[PDB]
Amino acid sequence: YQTERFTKFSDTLKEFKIEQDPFNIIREFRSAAGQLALDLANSGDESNVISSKDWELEARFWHLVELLLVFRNADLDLDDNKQLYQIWIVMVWLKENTYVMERPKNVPTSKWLNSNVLDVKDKEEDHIFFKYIYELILAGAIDEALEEAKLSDNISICMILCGIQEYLNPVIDTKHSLWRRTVYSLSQQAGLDPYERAIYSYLSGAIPNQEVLQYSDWESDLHIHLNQILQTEIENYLLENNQVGTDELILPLPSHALTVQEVLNRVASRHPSESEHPIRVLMASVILDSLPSVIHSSVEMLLDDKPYLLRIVTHLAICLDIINPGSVEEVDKSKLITTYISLLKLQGLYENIPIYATFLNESDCLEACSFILSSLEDPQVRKKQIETINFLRLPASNILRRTTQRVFDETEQEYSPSNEISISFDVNNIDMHLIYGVEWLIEGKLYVDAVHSIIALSRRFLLNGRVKALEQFMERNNIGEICKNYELEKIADNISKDENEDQFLEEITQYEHLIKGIREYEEWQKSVSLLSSESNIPTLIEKLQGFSKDTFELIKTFLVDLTSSNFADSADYEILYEIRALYTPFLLMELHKKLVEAAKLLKIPKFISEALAFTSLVANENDKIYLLFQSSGKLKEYLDLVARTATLSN
Amino acid sequence: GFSLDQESIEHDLKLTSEEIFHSNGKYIPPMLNTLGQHLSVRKEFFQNFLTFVAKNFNYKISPELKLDLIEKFEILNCCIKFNSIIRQSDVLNDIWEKTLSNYNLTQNEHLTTKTVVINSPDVFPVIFKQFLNHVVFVLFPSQNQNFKLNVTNLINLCFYDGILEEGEKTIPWFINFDYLNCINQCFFDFTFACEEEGSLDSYKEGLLKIVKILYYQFNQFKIWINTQPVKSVNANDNFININNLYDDNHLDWNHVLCKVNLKEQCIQIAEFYKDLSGLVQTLQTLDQNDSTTVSLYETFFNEFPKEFSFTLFEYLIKHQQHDVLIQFFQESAPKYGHVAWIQQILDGSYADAMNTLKNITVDDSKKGESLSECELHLNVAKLSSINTLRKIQYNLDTIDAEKNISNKLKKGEVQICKRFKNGSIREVFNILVEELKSTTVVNLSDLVELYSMLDDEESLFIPLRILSVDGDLLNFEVKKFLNALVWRRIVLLNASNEGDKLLQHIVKRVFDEELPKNNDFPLPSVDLLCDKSLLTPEYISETYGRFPIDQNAIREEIYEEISQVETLNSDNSLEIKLHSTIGSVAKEKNYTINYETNTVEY
Amino acid sequence: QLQLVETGGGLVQAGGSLRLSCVASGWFRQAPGKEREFVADYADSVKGRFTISRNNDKNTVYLQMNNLIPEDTAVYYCAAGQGTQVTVSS
C-alpha cells in the first residue's frame, strides 16, 4: 500500500480511462503523497521524517499545478488581462499552505509584571506576541488575525486590518493612491520591532531591511517580488487610470514590473542551498512547458538518481499530451514512454496497461510493444492483465509475432555444430518460455503463424540429444487446439487451401508419432531388469515391445515419405529429410539391446537377429530406404551392428 | 672294412644274445621256473657294455642299424614279465597261451606253441593282434571292469619300451617296420576301455579313468611320430597300395579318436601333450580351443605360445574377431563361402562386393540359407551404392520370387496341379515342399523349376514376368523351353475350362504392366510351343540333375506333355486362338504385332 | 499549524438536513473512490440545496445541507481539514 507509491498512482489513472471530467487526473495526485507523509507522522518511529520530508513537499506542488491548467483552458462562454491572473494563482498556494507557529503558552495576565522601567525580558515577551501576530497575517489569517489582534490587547495592529479590509474591498472592485505612499514612509521611521518592520513593507510592495530577510527562508523569500509587482502593476494601471489624481500622488513608484525569470534569478541566489531544490524548481518549468529538459540532463555526468522526479515528469506528459494535444514534445513523448517502461522494472507487473493511454506512435509501431516479450515467462497473472485496456487484433498479432521472431536470431549459433555436441541446457531452459506466448494467445485464426515454430527447431537438434522430442512434450501440454484451428480455419476464405491444410495435418502426425517413439524407447530402456525372476510377464511384454517396434518402423517410414517426391514447396522437403534419416538406426539396436540384458534368456537371439537383419533387406525396395545414409552418414554403422550376429546366432 | 668285420662279430653276438634273452646255457633251466627275467637282465647288463664300448664308432648307417637291431631283442624281453603277471592271472594267460598255441600250429605248424622263443619270437605281435581282434567278441562279451581290469596290464606292459630309447641316445625300412603293423590293432584298445567309460558310473570311476589315461596318451602321442618319419623316409606313396591304405585309413580314424580322447581328459594333460608331441595340431587345438574356459589368464599364455602356428590360422575356421587382426582373414584365407559377409571387416571391401556376387554364384552349387545372402546381397548392393544391373535384377527377382513362392506354398492357397497322377517322373512337389519348409527356401536354387508347378492360374501367371525381367542368365533354349512348358500347361487348362479363359487375363497382365517396352518378350506361337529341337540328354541331365531318377522316365513324361498338344492342335487352331486374342487385347494399347520376328512393338 | 477543526458530519436519511461547522484553529468533498471535488461559488450538484460557510474577515458564517440525497455521502474537507464524514442512506 504505502510502500507501493507507483501502484497508487496507477489506480488513479485507471479510473480516468474507465470514464472515457478531465481535471480529475491531477487531483488524485494529492491523495497519494499526502497519505505517505501522514503514514510516517501519525504513528511509528520519528527517524522516518528523513524520508517523509520528501513526501511533505511533493504534495503541495500538485496543488499549485491544478490552478494553472484550468485557467488557460476551461474558458467557459459565461456572461480582461489574462497574464495578471497568474499572480492570484501564486498567492493562493503561498498563503494557505504555509508554516504557522501556534498560540504562545503562558500568556501574562496583566502587563509589565517584572516592573526603561521594563527589564530585558519584557521587550522579548512583547516581541514574542509581535511575531505570533506578524506571521498569521502573512498567511491570510484575517479571520484569525482579526480575533488575534483583539485578543492580546494588541490594538496597535488592528488599524491596518481594516485598511487591508478597505484594500480588499478595492481589490474585489478591480481613493487610496495616497495611502500606498504613507506606509512606505512609515517603514523609514525609527522605532519598530523587526517583525513589525517587515509587515509594513510586505503589504504595500516594498523591500525591507536585509536583517529581517536573513531569518526569512529562501522558499518564502519569493513573496518579496510577488508583492512588489502587485503594488506596481496596480499603480501602473492605477496610474493609467489615474483615479486619485496627480496631487494624490506623493512619491514615484517603480511601476516597471519584471518577468518571472528576472525574479527567479534572485530567489535562487539568496538561499541557493535550498531554493534550488529538485522538488521546488519544477514550478518555473510549468510556465515554460519543457518536459525532457530536466531529466535528460542528468545522464551525461555519469562520473559522479532521484526516483520521485521520473514519476512526475512521465505522468505529466500523459496529461500534457491530453491537456493540449501534442503539448509534450513528440521526441520527449516517445522518450518518456520508453524511459517509463524501462524504469518500471520492479513495478512492471501492474503497469502493463497504464502505458497504453499515451500510445501515440511507440505503440502503433513495433516500439513500445516489444518489451513485454521479455518478462512474460511462467506466471499466468501478467498474461491475463494485458487483455484489458482495449487492446487486441493487430496488437495481439504483433506481440505474439515479436515473441517468436525475436528469439529465432539468438538460436543462430545452434546451427553451426553440424557434426559435434553443444550446450543445450539454455535451449532446454529458455525455449520453454518461448511457447507460453503462443499457448496463451488462444486464437483459432492466428494459428498458422505459430504452428511452425516447433518444426523450425528440428535442425538445431542435430546429433546426440534432440530438442524436438522435448518440444513434442510442450505441445502435448496444450493439445486440443488442433480442433480449434481446424474449425476456425473454415471461417476465413483462402485460395491455396489444398497445400496449407495438408502441411499442418502431416506435421501433427509425424510429431505425435515421434513423441510416441520417444516414450516407447523410454519404457524398454527403463525395463533394464524388470519383473525380476518372473519373466513370464516379460515374455509377453518384451513380445509386445518387439512387435510395437517392428510396426512403428514401417509406419514412420511411410509418414515421412508420404510427402511424395516432386512438390513446389521443396524447402519443407529438404528439412524433413534429415529427421527421417536420423530415426532409423536407433530402432535396430533396441532389438539387439535384448542381447545384453535379455541375453540371459536365449529367446531374443533367434528373434531380434532376423528381425533386424531383414530391416535393411526390405529397406531396398522402397528406393533403397531412400538414402538415409546419404543424409546422416550412417552406413558402416548398419554394416557392423548386424554383422555381430554371426558370433552369437551360431 | 673294419667296421663291417666288427658288425659281423656283433651280429653273431646278437644271435647268441637272442638265445640268451630267451634261454641261457649256463643257468640250470630245470632249477626253479622259466628264468625269462634273468635271461633279460643278462642282455640288459650287456647293453650297457655295448653302449660304453661303441662310444661314437658311427659309420654311415651302421650305428643306426645297430641301434635298430637292439630294439629287436630288448623290447620282447618285457613281455614275459606280463606273462608272470599273467601267470598270476593264470586262467586268462593259460587260455591265451593255448590260443596262441593253435595260432602257431595253424599259421606255421612247428608243434603249436613252445615257449622256447626261437628266432626271437617275432610272431608275438601277430598273436597279440589276433588276441586283440578276438577280444572284440570275447571281452566285449565281458564286462568293462573285466576287460577294463584286463587291458590295463597290456597297457602297462607296452608302456615300458620307451624308456630305453632315451637311454641309448637316439638321434631304413626295417626301422619303419619294427612297430607298424600293430597300429592295425592298437586302435581297438582305447575304445574298449573308453566305450565302457566309467562303466556307466562316473562318481566312482573318475579316478579309474584318471589313472588309466596315461597309457592311452603315451601310446598315441608316441606311435604318431613314427608315421610321418617313416613316410618322409620311405616315400612309398607312388606304390602306396596296401601299406598306404592301412596307414592312411588308420591315420584318419586315429585322428578322430585322439581328438575325443583329448577332450575327455584331466586339466592341462592334453595341453601338455599338445606341446610335448608336435602332431595332430588340429586335435590338440580342438582340446585347446577354450574347452576349459575363456579366462585371459591361461589362454593368452597358451595362445601367445603358438607363435609359429600357421596351422592355428586354420583353427579359426571351426566356428569371434580376435588375435590382433590376425592378418585379416588369415590373409583372406582362400574361398570364404559365408565368411565373406564377415569379410566386410568394417570396410567397403571389393572382395566383400565380389563376396555377395560370390554368394549368388555360390547359390549356383550346393548352397543353403539364402536369407543371409538375400539380405546380404541387398546389403552389399547398398554398400556399393555391367555387373551392377545384373546384381540388382538377380536380387529383386530371386528375392520376390522366393518370398511369394514360399508364402503361396506354405500357404497352400492354390490347391493342386490336377493333371499329374501316380507318376515317379516328378517328385519335385515333395522336393519343393521340403525346400519351402526351411533354410530360407533351402537357398532356393531351382527358381526355374519352381514356376513349373502350377495349381491355381493366379499362382502360375507370374513366371513370364521373371522370365522377361531377369532372364539374362540361361541360354535362349532354356528360356524358350520354360515359356513353352508354361504355354502348354495353359493350353491343357484352357481346353478343359470351357472357353479358353486362361489367356484372357495373362494377355492383359503382360500389357498393363508394360512388360514389352522393358522386355523384348518373344511372342509364343504354335511352332514356338511345339518345338522339340531343344530336347537333348545334356540339357536334361543339367536341368533335372538333383533327382536321381532315370532320365528315360522324364524324357517320356516330357514327350507325352509335348505330343498331347501336338495332337490336340488339330488344323493348328491354337494359332488363331492366340493371334486373335493377343492382337485384340494389344489393339487400343500402344502395341503392334512384329511379324518379322514374332515380337511386340508400339 | 492551521489546526482546522471541523465538526457536524454524520449519518442522515434521504431528505434530512445537516450543519457542518468549520473553525480554523489558526468546502470540498471526496466520495469513496473518486477525486476531491469542490462543493462550496457552488457546485452544479448542490446549487439550491446547500449553503456554504465562507465569510469575509473573521466570519465563519456556518451554514448547512438541506434535502440530502445518496449522491452526497462522502468525506468533506475544509480549505482556506482532516475530514468529516457525511453519509445519507437511501
Author numbering:
A (entry chain A): 7 to 26, 34 to 92, 112 to 147, 167 to 225, 239 to 368, 381 to 726
B (entry chain B): 519 to 689, 707 to 854, 866 to 931, 941 to 1157
C (entry chain C): 1 to 26, 36 to 49, 59 to 98, 122 to 131
Paper text:
Transport of soluble cargos across the NE occurs solely through nuclear pore complexes (NPCs), massive, proteinaceous assemblies that sit in circular openings where inner and outer nuclear membranes fuse, effectively perforating the NE. Here we report the structures of the Nup84-Nup133 C-terminal α-helical domain and Nup133 N-terminal β-propeller from S. cerevisiae. The structures were obtained using nanobodies, single domain antibodies derived from alpacas, as crystallization chaperones.
We solved the structure of full-length S. cerevisiae Nup84-Nup133 C-terminal domain (Nup133CTD, residues 521–1157) bound by a nanobody (VHH-SAN8) by single-wavelength anomalous dispersion (SAD) to 6.4 Å resolution using an Anderson-Evans polyoxotungstate derivative. Placement of the nanobody VHH-SAN8 was unambiguous as we observed large difference density near the Nup84 crown element. Interestingly, VHH-SAN8 binds at the interface between the crown and trunk elements, thereby potentially rigidifying this portion of the protein. Nup84 forms a continuous α-helical stack domain which, expectedly, belongs to the ACE1 architecture. Its 28 α-helices form a rectangular block with dimensions of ~124 × 37 × 46 Å, with α1–7 zig-zagging in one direction and α8–28 folding over and zig-zagging the opposite direction to the C-terminal end of the molecule. The C-terminal helices interact with Nup133CTD, which itself forms an elongated, highly arched stack of 26 α-helices. The Nup84-Nup133 binding interface is compact, with ~770 Å2 buried surface area, comprising α26-28 of Nup84 and α15–17 of Nup133.
